[PDB]
Design a protein around this ligand. Structure first.
Ligand SMILES: *[C@@H]1O[C@H](CO)[C@@H](O[C@@H]2O[C@H](CO)[C@@H](O)[C@H](O)[C@H]2NC(C)=O)[C@H](O[C@@H]2O[C@@H](C)[C@@H](O)[C@@H](O)[C@@H]2O)[C@H]1NC(C)=O
Ligand SMILES: *[C@@H]1O[C@H](CO)[C@@H](O[C@@H]2O[C@H](CO)[C@@H](O)[C@H](O)[C@H]2NC(C)=O)[C@H](O[C@@H]2O[C@@H](C)[C@@H](O)[C@@H](O)[C@@H]2O)[C@H]1NC(C)=O
Ligand SMILES: *[C@@H]1O[C@H](CO)[C@@H](O[C@@H]2O[C@H](CO)[C@@H](O)[C@H](O)[C@H]2NC(C)=O)[C@H](O[C@@H]2O[C@@H](C)[C@@H](O)[C@@H](O)[C@@H]2O)[C@H]1NC(C)=O
Lengths: 139, 139, 139
């Protein structure tokens, strides 16, 4: 597929608490990048930047522990929520806010996960975020 | 990929209650279509109609609120359930019946989501349904 | 895509209890294979064996009933967990441990689901496991 091979996947490998900057941006950070074909995933910002016009698939599963908060996690496209997922609060099991979607992106569009409500104190180990170009679009 | 570029994604953008017809069909309706490459998703019927033989990927996340019902949501292929997902009933958080699968479809096969058990009173805002042709098949 | 068309999907169609061997391996078994393009999914072992170097997408949803256990399900790559999902224990609804990810695999790498914690007594009907080659890689 040449320059139509674009894919990333990243995970949260520890239960370490959020940083001050993560608290300010509420952008969910993934420390371990498993795939980054095209180097279009910015691992410092946990943001995917589309290299070309196309249909992109995204999936995420944000895993939380008991921390007295319910959460809403949203896939953001240029600062606007496209889809959201939800998780509650209990002390029986880790639980996940999961969702996925296909979206059209232009070159330079940015996709990332934002904690719209709640916090991730206690860590978000086992959280995952991945995406790939399904096919490019011309015009 | 030419005529092998087929993709759709749709979401439920409001918490409005189901219509009379939705009550009769128990087919889950998505008011906002984000992607519809090939125009193979029938937005009036929330049904994907395969344009050609191939392997198709589908994912869904049906989000419910507290409404005194648990739900079973099934991906239907020509009126038969292929996969199902489940959600409970509580008043702490929105929660989702989520699943996904790859299936082979022939031209004219129809895929849609059906509420096999329960109801979506209180709305199903944030629900998502998407799919794409992974690759075509000949013969 | 020729030999770049690789895809599988399998489901658990009954609530039958795990076998002795399933108890010993804790590898989750799927009795009904819906898709197996390339015949790279070993249905006896519920293991996908990559035919070539590439980026592969995997998704799973393991559905449990009340059985006095919480579970952790992990996607294993050559015996090492890549991603995990979690489900609790209650008697209100079936519930699912769900996650998905993209990974790079070499020819001969093996991917399967393992019950890292808990059991699936009471069955795991409606569980699903699927995957496909997103694109091949050279070198
Ligand atoms: C990120 O936000 C968290 C939620 O607001 C912070 O935790 C809160 O910290 C308050 C004092 O900074 C404390 O009164 C709150 O009870 C506490 N809330 C929760 C739910 O834990 C977190 O700050 C961390 O904890 C405090 C005690 C300090 O030691 C910080 O250095 C910790 O990181 C925030 N983390 C930051 C700003 O780095
Ligand atoms: C779609 O099905 C719902 C579940 O059967 C309907 O709600 C039910 O409406 C009954 C009277 O129509 C009422 O006795 C039940 O308590 C109620 N059940 C629940 C769980 O809310 C729904 O009807 C809506 O509510 C009633 C009161 C009417 O105003 C309808 O016009 C409402 O839509 C059904 N909606 C339809 C048929 O449009
Ligand atoms: C697979 O593992 C299960 C969990 O260890 C077994 O169930 C357990 O069986 C014990 C006796 O074998 C019994 O004391 C435990 O209470 C029971 N635990 C649970 C949670 O059910 C299961 O064995 C099944 O049940 C027993 C009674 C025998 O009839 C086996 O033939 C059953 O399969 C294990 N299944 C195997 C080894 O095939």
């Amino acid at each position: 597929s040449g320059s139509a091979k674009v894919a990333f996947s990243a995970i949260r490998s520890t239960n370490h608490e959020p940083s001050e900057m993560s608290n300010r941006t509420m952008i969910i950070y993934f420390d371990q990048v498993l795939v980054n074909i095209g180097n279009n995933f910015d691992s410092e910002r946990s943001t995917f930047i589309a290299p070309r016009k196309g249909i992109y698939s995204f999936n995420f599963h944000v895993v939380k522990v008991y921390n007295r908060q319910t959460i809403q996690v949203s896939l953001m496209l240029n600062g606007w929520p496209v889809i959201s997922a939800f998780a509650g609060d209990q002390d029986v099991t880790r639980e996940a806010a999961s969702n996925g979607v296909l979206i059209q992106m232009e070159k330079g569009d940015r996709a990332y996960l934002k904690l719209e409500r709640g916090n991730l104190m206690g860590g978000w180990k086992y959280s995952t975020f991945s995406g790939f170009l399904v096919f490019p679009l011309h015009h």
